[PDB]
Nucleic acid binder design. Structure first.
Ligand SMILES: [Mg+2]
Ligand SMILES: [Mg+2]
Ligand SMILES: [Mg+2]
Ligand SMILES: [Mg+2]
Ligand SMILES: [Mg+2]
Ligand SMILES: [Mg+2]
Ligand SMILES: [Mg+2]
Ligand SMILES: [Mg+2]
Ligand SMILES: [Mg+2]
Ligand SMILES: [Mg+2]
Ligand SMILES: [Mg+2]
Ligand SMILES: [Mg+2]
Ligand SMILES: [Mg+2]
Ligand SMILES: [Mg+2]
Ligand SMILES: [Mg+2]
Ligand SMILES: [Mg+2]
Ligand SMILES: [Zn+2]
Lengths: 214, 63, 127, 25, 97
RNA sequence: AUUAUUGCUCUUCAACGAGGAAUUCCUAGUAAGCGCAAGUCAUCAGCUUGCGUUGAUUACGUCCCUGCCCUUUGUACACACC
RNA sequence: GGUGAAAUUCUUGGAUUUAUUGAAGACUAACUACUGCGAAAGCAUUUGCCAAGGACGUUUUCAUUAAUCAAGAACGAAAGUUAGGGGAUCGAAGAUGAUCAGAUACCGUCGUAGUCUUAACCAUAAACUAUGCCGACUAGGGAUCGGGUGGUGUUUUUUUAAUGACCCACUCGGCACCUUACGAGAAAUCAAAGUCUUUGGGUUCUGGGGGGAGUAUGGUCGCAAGGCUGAAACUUAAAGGAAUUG
């Protein structure tokens, strides 16, 4: 004597700008009854979707993305950058035995006071013409590499908030430039920013929030 | 009904713990050059003719 | 094309769970598990009931508002088995065959930078 | 009987003669 | 008397390492003295590739497997998995397959 | 010859309408169906040992049950896991 | 939910399942290996500070300053003790559901102490390589960690280099594996367990059939639990080791 199916006021999710398709998907809410409606109550739900989906290309078949809902109008609600995380299976495949892992992170602030932390992971490359079955680093060299990753990472940010951050990650200049400064010290391969967590997002600023909506 | 006839090409062994089923690779005389392996029931030899019903569902090991 | 959803198959031992929800998550849509489509305690994780519940799941799924769905399968994890269960893929089989689309799937098993001492004792679980 | 428990066995007896002897002060 | 040159299992110049548990029975057991099976497997299985490609979008997809370390405890490592048992000489062989 | 050794004729006309869970035997003139001689024997074969008569179906395989043999392995047993 | 199977259990207290966010305390997965370091116990997230160490390099400096050790002392796993914090986890006792003839257990549930840290005790482990320390000599191999020497060697391009990783040769000091066995051993096996009746480099410790017994006694140490020192009467023909065949 219920069945909330024939009651579910439906809705559609839209994607941000600096990507490909701004059309994400479909959802389920409720009848916008007075006092606790379907208005400002829910909204802020967040979606995990691979960006090989929302971009269409397949050279991005891991780098999963987390989008947070902010504003909603005219049977339509957008979303801003809220997360980027790698996939279990991908690293599970990345971490192969007989080599040195390297991990580092750092807390940082963008121009528009979006406070977050970014990560970094890389593996010593077995150079060709090599005999030794394993190839390990030299700790001190690992100190060095982590140091430079820290420098570079805290250099790329403090630049036009999410928008530009995503604009630096999507084409991965970070990876290739870490690769650039790296090869002087020690081989190293893969090299992925792997993960970045938001923790202290600023205020609403609805106007400036409409910065990726044409 | 699209029943398709396939001739035994080789006898591959007995599967199933009981040891009755026989692994055999066949080729249908309905457009040749298209080998598919099946598992029988009764006794068989080379160059017999099995009525394969479905034409894309082959098998291998039993238990 | 179709309409995206999330399947979420927590199918470790002893049971088998399926429920599509909103791609954001805060809006679930139909569930049902393996212990419902048979009763025997011992038969609560078997691939059969898994198939049956995958049926009862896809059924209401394509009968409310979603006709396609990405999945994320998960073992117990934490400080437990971490290895997938009996009706793990047995439910995956009967939700693609049941005429519903699939779109990239992964593993949300909660592997830790391990700790919180496991159950059992240093002497194991002898029997 | 196990060497560990025979160790415990005497450790106990020893602890008891201890007590009995204490009566004599 | 003694019947293993690596005593229990490989550890030479340590005295202590660090114990870990058993994925089967949870028995604590030193890492050096464990037994490790790098467990790998597609999410699918035998006859499930067909229902993947046929009931999904994409071109050929990608099909991501799963890796996970398998730790066992000699007792459970003999109860089923890597063990059998070997002759006196069949014992010194460090050949996996 | 009663508690009826066996044989005969009349009369009497039972249960059993294919048999639960389980379980025995078997691969060709074999299975099964059919009778005879022989042992026992004064008399008494629904038994037995043999014999021929009629004469199929299904395998030609496997380790799932069972039983066993063989290796590696443990042993503090050797009067040998009673 | 839980196991072999079950029950104890949890479920308008919307439980298991889901999403979002927060806190607490442990912990350091994968990478992690016959790989490193420390006297031993032991020691793996990050960064900074603090003092230390070996191997190497060395046409530097002193010039016998050393070797091994009764007494004496430093540290010393886990539990355990005192006083605070901490108390997620897991979890001696205790209570329980099953299980069996019984089941004070094994399995499941509740869960105190405990686990973590600070200040102080305690001083034991199969604290194991069941193998004292320093020095010499005695035999082949490819490994691999650290240091060094060598190169019209490789891969890095900027214009050739300079670095860096890699290849190769050599020599130190390492964690070890391989084959041998001259030689050793009761054997298993041992590059020391070898250079031992053809018996002697230096030095410390312990053992002298089994049981009684690490018991009794004294002393000493500790808050306690206990630690070190540690007999005898009597008893007994074997205990015991490695290998062989069943
Ligand atoms: Mg008194
Ligand atoms: Mg032994
Ligand atoms: Mg030790
Ligand atoms: Mg019949
Ligand atoms: Mg007769
Ligand atoms: Mg008779
Ligand atoms: Mg033997
Ligand atoms: Mg780590
Ligand atoms: Mg507690
Ligand atoms: Mg109790
Ligand atoms: Mg008790
Ligand atoms: Mg001692
Ligand atoms: Mg040892
Ligand atoms: Mg040598
Ligand atoms: Mg006495
Ligand atoms: Mg006294
Ligand atoms: Zn185990």
């Amino acid at each position: 004597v219920v069945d909330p199916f024939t009651r579910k006021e439906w809705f559609d999710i839209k994607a941000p700008s600096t990507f490909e398709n701004r059309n994400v998907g479909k959802t389920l809410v409720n009848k916008s009854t007075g006092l606790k409606s379907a208005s400002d109550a829910l909204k802020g739900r967040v979606v995990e979707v691979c960006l090989a989906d929302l971009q269409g290309s397949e050279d991005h078949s891991f780098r999963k993305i987390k989008l947070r809902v902010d504003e909603v109008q005219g049977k339509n609600l957008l979303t801003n950058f809220h997360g980027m995380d790698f996939t279990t299976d991908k690293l599970r495949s990345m971490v192969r035995k007989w080599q040195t892992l390297i991990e580092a992170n750092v807390t940082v602030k963008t121009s528009d006071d979006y406070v977050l932390r970014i990560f970094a992971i890389a593996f010593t490359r077995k150079q060709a013409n090599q005999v030794k079955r394993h190839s390990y680093a030299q700790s001190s060299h690992i100190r060095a590499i982590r140091k430079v990753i820290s420098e570079i990472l805290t250099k790329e940010v403090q630049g036009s908030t999410l928008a530009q951050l995503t604009s630096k990650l999507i084409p991965e200049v970070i990876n290739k430039e870490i690769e650039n400064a790296t090869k002087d010290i020690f081989p190293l391969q893969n090299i992925h920013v792997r993960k970045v967590k938001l923790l202290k997002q600023p205020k609403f600023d609805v106007g400036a929030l409409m910065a990726l909506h044409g | 009904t699209p029943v398709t006839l396939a001739k035994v090409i080789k006898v591959l062994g007995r599967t199933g713990s009981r040891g009755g089923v026989t692994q055999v690779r066949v080729e249908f005389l309905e457009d040749t050059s298209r080998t598919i392996v099946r598992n029988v029931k009764g006794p068989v030899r080379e160059n017999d003719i099995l009525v394969l019903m479905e034409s894309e569902r082959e098998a291998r090991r039993l238990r | 094309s179709q309409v995206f959803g999330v399947a979420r198959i927590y199918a470790s031992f002893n049971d088998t769970f399926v429920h599509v929800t909103d791609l954001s998550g805060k809006e679930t849509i139909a569930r049902v598990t393996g212990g419902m489509k048979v009763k025997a305690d011992r038969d609560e994780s078997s691939p059969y009931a898994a198939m049956l519940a995958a049926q009862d799941v896809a059924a209401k799924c394509k009968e409310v508002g979603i006709t396609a769905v990405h999945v994320k399968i998960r073992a117990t994890g934490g400080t437990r088995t971490k290895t997938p269960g009996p009706g793990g893929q047995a439910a995956l089989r009967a939700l693609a065959r049941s005429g519903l689309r699939i779109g990239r799937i992964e593993d949300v098993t909660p592997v830790p930078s391990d700790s919180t001492r496991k159950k059992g004792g240093r002497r194991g679980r002898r029997l | 009987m196990r060497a560990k428990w025979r160790k415990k066995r005497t450790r106990r007896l020893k602890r008891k003669r201890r007590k009995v002897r204490a009566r004599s002060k | 008397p003694k019947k293993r040159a690596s005593n229990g299992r490989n550890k030479k110049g340590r005295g202590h390492v660090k114990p870990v548990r058993c994925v089967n029975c949870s028995k604590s057991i030193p890492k050096d003295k464990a037994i490790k099976r790098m467990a790998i497997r597609n999410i699918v299985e035998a006859a499930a590739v067909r229902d993947l490609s046929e009931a999904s979008v994409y071109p050929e997809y990608a099909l991501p497997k799963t890796y996970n370390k398998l730790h066992y405890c000699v007792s459970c490592a003999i109860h089923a998995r890597i063990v059998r048992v070997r002759s006196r000489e069949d014992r010194k062989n460090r050949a996996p397959p």
